[PDB]
């Protein structure tokens, strides 16, 4: 059949092809997502879950209140949807709405990073001890890997020098 057209077909084509070919799904947010995640590349390192629990997460998303919603975590998506809402309802420009939703995102991210530090320090003032932090755990792993490289380099270095001895002609000793 004639597949659904998710974007206006070229009105200039006089004999177009691929009429029975499904089209690409493009939304207005695709433009904003690319703009945001390029300004904040390390925002992708924040692990985000795409597995859906029941699929009803969209029933409680009212972007007129703010970034913090029910069910979904504070991510770059919340900034895009909040941006899109302001850009449509409040008639804001792409840049203006971007600044507003973007600034509310920072102030929320700051408080989350401040809690970790204050929480640990507060706990130790009352006799609270923790386990190995990611910094120390990361260095220990590098040691185990570096040692393996030292062995390989030591073994390879031996082979190269030994090769040189054999390469040079010492067939007759005088």
């Amino acid at each position: 059949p004639y597949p659904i057209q998710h974007s206006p077909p070229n009105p200039r084509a006089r004999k177009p092809r691929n009429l029975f070919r499904p089209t690409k799904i493009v939304y207005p947010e695709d433009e904003l997502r690319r703009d945001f995640y390029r300004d904040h590349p390390w925002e992708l390192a924040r692990p985000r879950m795409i597995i859906e629990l029941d699929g009803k997460d969209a029933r409680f998303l009212d972007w007129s209140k703010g970034l913090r919603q029910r069910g979904i975590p504070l991510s770059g998506e919340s900034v895009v949807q909040r941006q899109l809402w302001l850009m449509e309802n409040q008639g804001m420009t792409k840049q203006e709405a971007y600044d507003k939703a973007r600034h509310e995102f920072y102030k929320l991210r700051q408080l989350e990073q401040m809690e970790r530090r204050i929480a640990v320090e507060e706990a130790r003032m009352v006799g609270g001890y923790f386990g190995k932090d990611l910094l120390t755990v990361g260095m220990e792993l590098e040691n185990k890997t570096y040692e393996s490289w030292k062995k390989w380099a030591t073994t390879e270095i031996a082979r190269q020098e030994s090769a040189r001895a054999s390469m040079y002609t010492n067939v007759v000793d005088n």
Binding site: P73, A119, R124, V126, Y129, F130, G131, K132
Partner: protein, 260 residues
């Protein structure tokens, strides 16, 4: 998401008669627990803890220093509800079996009362006073009192956040100061390296919190005021609390070995 569950015996609607006003319990549990849960949801909204109960979060995020802020809200919600799930509308008569076990570990029923109340005031800070049930491999079932600070946990699985005594007023150069200080570093050193100082039975069956007392100021500074001149305040709050202890439930969860 984590939602507020109703209380035991319709306290949110009426509140205990001679312990807490209906409006005090409203601000103590309904308005506060909802606030903590609201903050808790935002922290585990997109993690593995999104569908885990409070206790599971209390034990999972105990040692991890990057999730310390999550442990507070989780343990605070558990310790808070644990305190309200042991009260009753009318005082209950202590059981004979439990009444005999307390005397064997504290000398008399009131001797334990003045100990818990005394520990609450002596602590001078937001925390919880626990009546734990410790049983070692070969030791009989013995009870003891334990105090936990702002959001401390009595369970052994969360020994990383027990928060039993303060460091500002218990670590100095005096003979007791040096001893307390050594234990502080010994724990942090052993905990970091992974070594355990005191062996624990599998399943965390060593300590079983029976009773609790929420000494947080937001629960009593309204009903009993500050306590100027000794009338009311934190002291009277602890005393009145002793009258509503559901000793029947305290005996059931104790699970004392048949010995008589």
């Amino acid at each position: 998401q984590h939602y507020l569950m109703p209380l035991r015996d319709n306290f949110e609607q009426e509140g205990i008669r001679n312990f807490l006003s209906p409006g005090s319990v409203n601000m103590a549990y309904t308005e506060y627990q909802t606030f903590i849960l609201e903050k808790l949801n935002a922290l585990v909204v997109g993690t593995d803890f999104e569908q885990k109960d409070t206790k599971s979060i209390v034990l999972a995020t105990a040692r991890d220093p990057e999730l310390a802020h999550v442990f507070n809200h989780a343990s605070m919600a558990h310790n808070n509800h644990f305190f309200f799930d042991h009260l009753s509308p009318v005082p209950v008569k202590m059981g004979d079996k439990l009444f005999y076990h307390i005397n064997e570990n504290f000398g008399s029923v009131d001797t334990l009362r003045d100990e818990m109340i005394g520990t609450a005031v002596s602590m001078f800070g937001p925390g919880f006073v626990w009546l734990v049930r410790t049983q070692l491999p070969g030791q009989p079932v013995a009870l003891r009192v334990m105090a936990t600070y702002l959001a401390g946990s009595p369970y052994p699985g969360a020994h990383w956040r027990r928060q039993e005594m303060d460091a500002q007023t218990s670590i100095g150069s005096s003979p007791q100061g040096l001893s307390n200080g050594q234990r502080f570093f010994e724990r942090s050193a052993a905990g970091f390296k992974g070594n355990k100082l005191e062996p624990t039975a599998p399943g965390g069956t060593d300590l079983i919190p029976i009773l609790c007392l929420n000494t947080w100021e937001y629960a009593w500074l309204r009903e009993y005021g500050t306590g100027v001149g000794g009338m009311g305040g934190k002291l009277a709050y602890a005393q009145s609390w002793w009258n509503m202890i559901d000793w029947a439930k305290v005996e059931e969860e104790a699970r004392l070995e048949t010995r008589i």
